[PDB]
Enzyme design. Structure first.
Site, PDB file in Angstrom:
ATOM      1  N   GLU A   1     -62.947 -56.915  34.312  1.00 52.01           N
ATOM      2  CA  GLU A   1     -63.395 -57.001  32.921  1.00 52.01           C
ATOM      3  C   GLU A   1     -62.845 -55.854  32.070  1.00 52.01           C
ATOM      4  O   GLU A   1     -62.262 -56.117  31.002  1.00 52.01           O
ATOM      5  CB  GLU A   1     -64.939 -57.048  32.895  1.00 52.01           C
ATOM      6  CG  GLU A   1     -65.527 -58.362  33.320  1.00 52.01           C
ATOM      7  CD  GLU A   1     -67.047 -58.282  33.693  1.00 52.01           C
ATOM      8  OE1 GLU A   1     -67.692 -57.201  33.517  1.00 52.01           O
ATOM      9  OE2 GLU A   1     -67.580 -59.307  34.178  1.00 52.01           O
TER      10      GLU A   1
ATOM     11  N   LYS B   1     -75.154 -63.889  38.181  1.00 52.29           N
ATOM     12  CA  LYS B   1     -74.154 -62.862  38.451  1.00 52.29           C
ATOM     13  C   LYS B   1     -74.751 -61.728  39.278  1.00 52.29           C
ATOM     14  O   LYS B   1     -74.037 -61.052  40.032  1.00 52.29           O
ATOM     15  CB  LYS B   1     -73.611 -62.331  37.129  1.00 52.29           C
ATOM     16  CG  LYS B   1     -72.320 -61.513  37.259  1.00 52.29           C
ATOM     17  CD  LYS B   1     -71.587 -61.497  35.941  1.00 52.29           C
ATOM     18  CE  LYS B   1     -70.555 -60.398  35.859  1.00 52.29           C
ATOM     19  NZ  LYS B   1     -69.857 -60.409  34.505  1.00 52.29           N
TER      20      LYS B   1
ATOM     21  N   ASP C   1     -64.518 -65.334  30.434  1.00 52.22           N
ATOM     22  CA  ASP C   1     -65.424 -64.235  30.699  1.00 52.22           C
ATOM     23  C   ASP C   1     -66.729 -64.852  31.221  1.00 52.22           C
ATOM     24  O   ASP C   1     -67.473 -65.505  30.480  1.00 52.22           O
ATOM     25  CB  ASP C   1     -65.643 -63.403  29.448  1.00 52.22           C
ATOM     26  CG  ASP C   1     -66.778 -62.393  29.606  1.00 52.22           C
ATOM     27  OD1 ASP C   1     -67.145 -62.089  30.755  1.00 52.22           O
ATOM     28  OD2 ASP C   1     -67.288 -61.880  28.579  1.00 52.22           O
TER      29      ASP C   1
ATOM     30  N   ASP D   1     -68.676 -50.658  27.834  1.00 54.48           N
ATOM     31  CA  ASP D   1     -69.095 -52.053  27.837  1.00 54.48           C
ATOM     32  C   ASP D   1     -70.614 -52.107  27.949  1.00 54.48           C
ATOM     33  O   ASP D   1     -71.170 -51.974  29.052  1.00 54.48           O
ATOM     34  CB  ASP D   1     -68.431 -52.809  28.984  1.00 54.48           C
ATOM     35  CG  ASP D   1     -68.656 -54.315  28.915  1.00 54.48           C
ATOM     36  OD1 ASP D   1     -69.497 -54.751  28.125  1.00 54.48           O
ATOM     37  OD2 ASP D   1     -67.980 -55.060  29.647  1.00 54.48           O
TER      38      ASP D   1
HETATM   39  N1  LIG Z   1     -75.089 -57.631  15.844  1.00 49.64           N
HETATM   40  C1  LIG Z   1     -75.676 -57.223  17.018  1.00 49.64           C
HETATM   41  N2  LIG Z   1     -76.414 -56.100  17.066  1.00 49.64           N
HETATM   42  C2  LIG Z   1     -77.017 -55.678  18.201  1.00 49.64           C
HETATM   43  N3  LIG Z   1     -76.885 -56.345  19.375  1.00 49.64           N
HETATM   44  C3  LIG Z   1     -76.155 -57.473  19.449  1.00 49.64           C
HETATM   45  C4  LIG Z   1     -75.492 -57.997  18.246  1.00 49.64           C
HETATM   46  N4  LIG Z   1     -74.825 -59.118  18.623  1.00 49.64           N
HETATM   47  C5  LIG Z   1     -75.062 -59.314  19.938  1.00 49.64           C
HETATM   48  N5  LIG Z   1     -75.864 -58.333  20.403  1.00 49.64           N
HETATM   49  C6  LIG Z   1     -76.339 -58.175  21.765  1.00 49.64           C
HETATM   50  O1  LIG Z   1     -75.351 -58.224  22.777  1.00 49.64           O
HETATM   51  C7  LIG Z   1     -75.878 -58.755  23.988  1.00 49.64           C
HETATM   52  C8  LIG Z   1     -74.914 -59.748  24.586  1.00 49.64           C
HETATM   53  O2  LIG Z   1     -73.668 -59.084  24.831  1.00 49.64           O
HETATM   54  P1  LIG Z   1     -72.578 -59.792  25.741  1.00 49.64           P
HETATM   55  O3  LIG Z   1     -71.326 -59.017  25.626  1.00 49.64           O
HETATM   56  O4  LIG Z   1     -72.597 -61.236  25.545  1.00 49.64           O
HETATM   57  O5  LIG Z   1     -73.313 -59.468  27.178  1.00 49.64           O
HETATM   58  P2  LIG Z   1     -72.759 -59.817  28.638  1.00 49.64           P
HETATM   59  O6  LIG Z   1     -71.233 -59.692  28.500  1.00 49.64           O
HETATM   60  O7  LIG Z   1     -73.326 -58.753  29.511  1.00 49.64           O
HETATM   61  O8  LIG Z   1     -73.209 -61.189  28.964  1.00 49.64           O
HETATM   62  C9  LIG Z   1     -77.271 -59.309  23.669  1.00 49.64           C
HETATM   63  O9  LIG Z   1     -78.209 -58.412  24.194  1.00 49.64           O
HETATM   64  C10 LIG Z   1     -77.371 -59.293  22.134  1.00 49.64           C
HETATM   65  O10 LIG Z   1     -78.635 -59.004  21.612  1.00 49.64           O
HETATM   66 MG   LIG Z   2     -70.161 -61.700  28.157  1.00 46.05          MG
END
Ligand SMILES: Nc1ncnc2c1ncn2[C@@H]1O[C@H](COP(=O)(O)OP(=O)(O)O)[C@@H](O)[C@H]1O
Ligand SMILES: [Mg+2]
Length: 378
Positions: free
Chosen positions: A172, A67, A6, A191
């Site tokens: 995705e 990205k 991913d 998502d």
């Molecule tokens: N327990 C949680 N509660 C709230 N937000 C969370 C938690 N764990 C991760 N996040 C949030 O999720 C986001 C990252 O999600 P992710 O799926 O990695 O994003 P992307 O796929 O777009 O890179 C960050 O903004 C982070 O603060």
């Molecule tokens: Mg991610």
């Protein structure tokens, strides 16, 4: 040996499907996802946690959001909008492609967006190699469903730059559905990540997925919830420190945002959290207590509006919400209880698919597809 990667907007994730089960692979620091960050220093090139953790000290040479640029031309209106967010320099080359300019070892270096992404992919590759104790070359890489041919081909090229044999680029949301092993079924992927929000409606017919509609918000994610806490803390600091404005210092803000994001995560499982920054502005320590209710209150309108793209994909699919068979929660921000509550209520109490850690589900399904494409039907 084939892995699933991913390549996320803010965090990437790598998994491997062996003997029919998927192991998500933690990186050096034990984190099951890795920041899509690359930093350049007088001495070394940093990728992942090391890059992000140093961002506040070296914002001009710490790159992220590649990205948002991969496969795009520099003149596109999205680039003009997105860039007032980036502390790093982005310019257009002769060919019209974005060039990311930084300083590395006291020298000026420019990189195409796919070169930055290749560095993140190479990191995820090495993460898997360390876990496996052997080299890895084959991989499936996911992209958003709305990515066009240029963005997809540029993502594939990034894989080849990283030394990977890219077996296939896949969507995705379809990866997330595959992760859950999901007659015709209407599936809605919700998502909500760190910088972006994507809603996709899929149909599953004869084991074949079809993307019927997509919508979302390319500038709604967890980071924006962090900024609501940051705005609150800036007003709070001013009220208790004679009107001193922390926002006028970029380091102080970034240090504060980092702590706001940490507390936000705590509020997903606790009723309140503390945001603490020693010597935040001048020599003044900062400390505040934030309840879940106040955090919810600050973000309610943004939480509520995640449903508007849901209504749009259903409208575009000529579908009533009661016809959705499964709702899949993807993205780390779907851990917020109020978000889950709003979705469930909108779908009249339907429990969503959320058992798979939401920031891993995309890699999870990607690894599944990587195994199948390797001849492993387990
Ligand atoms: N327990 C949680 N509660 C709230 N937000 C969370 C938690 N764990 C991760 N996040 C949030 O999720 C986001 C990252 O999600 P992710 O799926 O990695 O994003 P992307 O796929 O777009 O890179 C960050 O903004 C982070 O603060
Ligand atoms: Mg991610």
């Amino acid at each position: 040996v084939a892995i699933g990667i991913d390549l996320g907007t803010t965090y990437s994730c790598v998994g491997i499907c062996r003997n029919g089960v998927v192991d998500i692979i933690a990186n050096d620091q034990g984190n099951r996802t890795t920041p899509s960050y690359v930093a350049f220093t007088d001495t070394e090139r940093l990728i992942g946690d090391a890059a992000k953790n140093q961002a506040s000290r070296n914002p001009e040479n710490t790159v992220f959001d590649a990205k948002r640029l991969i496969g795009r031309k520099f003149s596109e209106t999205t680039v003009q909008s997105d860039m007032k967010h980036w502390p790093f320099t982005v310019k257009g080359g002769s060919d019209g492609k974005p060039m990311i300019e930084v300083s590395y070892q006291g020298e000026k270096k420019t990189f195409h967006p796919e070169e930055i992404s290749s560095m993140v992919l190479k990191k995820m590759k090495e993460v898997a190699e360390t876990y496996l104790g052997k080299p890895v070359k084959n991989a499936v890489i996911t992209v958003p469903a709305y990515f066009n041919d240029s963005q997809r081909q540029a993502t594939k090229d990034a894989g080849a730059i990283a030394g990977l044999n890219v077996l296939r680029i896949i969507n995705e949301p379809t990866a997330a559905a595959i992760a859950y092993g999901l007659g015709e079924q209407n599936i809605l992927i919700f998502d909500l990540g760190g910088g972006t929000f994507d809603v996709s409606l899929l149909t599953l017919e004869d084991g074949i997925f079809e993307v019927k509609a997509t919508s979302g918000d390319t500038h709604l994610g967890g980071e924006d919830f962090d900024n609501k806490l940051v705005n609150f803390c800036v007003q709070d600091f001013k009220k208790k420190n004679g009107g001193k404005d922390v926002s006028k210092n970029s380091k102080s803000l970034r240090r504060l945002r980092t702590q706001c994001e940490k507390a936000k995560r705590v509020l997903s499982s606790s009723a309140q959290a503390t945001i603490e920054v020693d010597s935040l502005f001048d020599g003044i320590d900062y400390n505040v207590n934030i309840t879940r209710a106040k955090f919810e209150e600050l973000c309610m309108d943004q939480f509520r509006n995640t449903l508007i793209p849901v209504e749009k994909v259903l409208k575009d699919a000529k579908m009533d919400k009661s016809q959705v068979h499964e709702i899949v929660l993807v993205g780390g921000s779907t851990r917020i209880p109020k978000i889950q509550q709003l979705i469930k209520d909108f779908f009249n109490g339907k429990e969503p698919c959320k058992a798979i850690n939401p920031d891993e589900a995309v890699a999870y399904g990607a690894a599944v597809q990587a195994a199948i494409l390797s001849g492993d039907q387990s």
